[PDB]
Ligand binder design. Structure first.
Ligand code: CL
Ligand code: CL
Ligand code: CL
Ligand code: CL
Ligand code: CL
Ligand code: CL
Length: 280
């Protein structure tokens, strides 16, 4: 059914028109805290901000702000934290959020350098013997293991609260092969990555929400969560044909602005859900 709709949109070439309707219908909520002058250096992009009502608050007393949003999908029973690629000054905030929200997995959909410029700080250690200390938030991060593949890379990290000496194992899932221009022609490797994150148990309700990010945390990050939620809904509803990707995306945009940044990313999201449902 969804495939029949997909081909009809492709034949008429209505992806730009459908995507523009989504932008027009999307929720508009204030981002007052994100726009405070003291938080200018905590935002990577001036036009991408978390809504006040869904923003993740740090448990510190000075400044609790981080550019991160909690997406709670009620019917699908999944929660995600969508955030920007950390800045050199917000890497300690990032791991503070991971600790306080009790996240088990971190999903990275970008490379540190894309389009010939920096898109994300090197917020995790590349070498086991060179651990990272975040002095502002009192956390230690150690690379425990790294399993590299052609399209992705899974790392085991140890995050330590230096105040209590508690340690947690964080799984870091890095998708490294998103094309420099446009979207992938096939959703196969992106779906393989999603199924790998699922298989790890990082999305389980036993854990805090998975942290998902790209550079701005709305484009590829939106595609990841949209596909995962739609696949969940198709497996849970009695009538799996009733899953409307546009409705699900609009629901997600109640929690973070701008999810899915292009009409090509919208088409790719449909493609990933259709092909992901066939494999499931
Ligand atoms: Cl990278
Ligand atoms: Cl590059
Ligand atoms: Cl950076
Ligand atoms: Cl991005
Ligand atoms: Cl729906
Ligand atoms: Cl938008």
């Amino acid at each position: 059914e969804m495939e029949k709709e997909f081909e009809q949109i492709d034949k008429s070439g209505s992806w730009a028109a459908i995507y523009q309707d989504i932008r027009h219908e999307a929720s508009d909520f204030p981002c007052r805290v994100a726009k405070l002058p003291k938080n200018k250096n905590r935002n990577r992009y001036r036009d991408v901000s978390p809504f006040d009502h869904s923003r993740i608050k740090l448990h510190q007393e000075d400044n609790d702000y981080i550019n991160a949003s909690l997406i709670k999908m009620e019917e699908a029973q999944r929660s995600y934290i969508l955030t920007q690629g950390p800045l050199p000054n917000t890497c300690g905030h990032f791991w503070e959020m991971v600790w306080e929200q009790k996240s088990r997995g971190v999903v990275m959909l970008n490379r540190v350098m894309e389009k010939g410029s920096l898109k994300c700080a090197q917020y995790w250690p590349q070498k086991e013997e060179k651990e990272m200390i975040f002095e502002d938030t009192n956390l230690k991060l150690t690379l425990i293991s790294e399993d590299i593949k052609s399209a992705a890379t899974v790392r085991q990290l140890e995050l330590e609260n230096l105040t209590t000496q508690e340690t947690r194992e964080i799984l870091h899932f890095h998708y490294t092969t998103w094309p420099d221009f446009g979207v992938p022609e096939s959703p196969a490797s992106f779906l393989n990555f999603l199924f790998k994150v699922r298989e790890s148990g990082s999305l389980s309700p036993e854990h805090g929400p998975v942290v998902v990010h790209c550079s701005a945390g709305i484009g590829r990050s939106g595609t990841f969560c949209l596909a995962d939620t739609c696949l969940l809904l198709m497996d849970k509803r009695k009538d799996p044909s009733s899953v409307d990707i546009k409705k699900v995306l609009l629901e997600m945009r109640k929690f973070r602005m701008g999810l899915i940044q292009t009409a090509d990313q919208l088409r790719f999201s449909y493609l990933a859900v259709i092909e992901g449902a066939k494999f499931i």
